[PDB]
Amino acid sequence: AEKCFDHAAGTSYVVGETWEKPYQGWMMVDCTCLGEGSGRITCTSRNRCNDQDTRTSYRIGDTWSKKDNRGNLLQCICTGNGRGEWKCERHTS
């Protein structure tokens, strides 16, 4: 039973396990254990859209406005369709 201690989490995950692990501070992705030799963990966010503009990981079916780099406001949404395709649509007035 190769465990995948996430250390910063202080929790183990027997091979073939999956849990939640906040990335930087607000980000969050599903860290899965695959046991390679010392405890490898494939963390990926396919169902947890995360925007680095508001510093807040959204969920599936959620929605949040997020400008780009000019000052507009792309009303993005975590459509979640296979890998969290949270798209962003500027204000189309």
Swiss-Prot record:
In the record, what disease is this protein associated with?
Answer: Glomerulopathy with fibronectin deposits 2: Genetically heterogeneous autosomal dominant disorder characterized clinically by proteinuria, microscopic hematuria, and hypertension that leads to end-stage renal failure in the second to fifth decade of life. Spondylometaphyseal dysplasia, corner fracture type: An autosomal dominant form of spondylometaphyseal dysplasia, a group of short stature disorders distinguished by abnormalities in the vertebrae and the metaphyses of the tubular bones. SMDCF is characterized by flake-like, triangular, or curvilinear ossification centers at the edges of irregular metaphyses that simulate fractures. These corner fractures involve the distal tibia, the ulnar aspect of the distal radius, the proximal humerus, and the proximal femur.
Outline the subunit composition.
Mostly heterodimers or multimers of alternatively spliced variants, connected by 2 disulfide bonds near the carboxyl ends; to a lesser extent homodimers. Interacts with FBLN1, AMBP, TNR, LGALS3BP and COL13A1. Interacts with FBLN7. Interacts with COMP. Interacts (via type III repeats 9-14) with TNFAIP6 (via CUB domain); this interaction enhances fibronectin fibril assembly. TNFAIP6 may act as a bridging molecule between FN1 and THBS1. Interacts with TNR; the interaction inhibits cell adhesion and neurite outgrowth. Interacts with FST3 and MYOC. Interacts with SVEP1.
What name goes with this protein? Fibronectin
**PTM comment:** Sulfated.
The scientific name of the source species is Homo sapiens
| Subcellular localization | Secreted, Extracellular space, Extracellular matrix; Secreted
Expressed in which tissues: Expressed in the inner limiting membrane and around blood vessels in the retina (at protein level). Plasma FN (soluble dimeric form) is secreted by hepatocytes. Cellular FN (dimeric or cross-linked multimeric forms), made by fibroblasts, epithelial and other cell types, is deposited as fibrils in the extracellular matrix. Ugl-Y1, Ugl-Y2 and Ugl-Y3 are found in urine.
Q: From the record, give the cysteines joined by S-S bonds.
A: C4-C33, C31-C43, C49-C78, C76-C88
| Segments forming domain Fibronectin type-I | 2-46, 47-91
Q: Report which part of the complete sequence is shown.
A: 183 to 275 of 2477
Q: Which gene is this protein's source? A: FN1
Q: Which domain of life is it from?
A: Eukaryota
User: What is this organism's lineage?
Assistant: Eukaryota, Metazoa, Chordata, Craniata, Vertebrata
Q: What does this protein do?
A: Fibronectins bind cell surfaces and various compounds including collagen, fibrin, heparin, DNA, and actin. Fibronectins are involved in cell adhesion, cell motility, opsonization, wound healing, and maintenance of cell shape. Involved in osteoblast compaction through the fibronectin fibrillogenesis cell-mediated matrix assembly process, essential for osteoblast mineralization. Participates in the regulation of type I collagen deposition by osteoblasts. Acts as a ligand for the LILRB4 receptor, inhibiting FCGR1A/CD64-mediated monocyte activation.
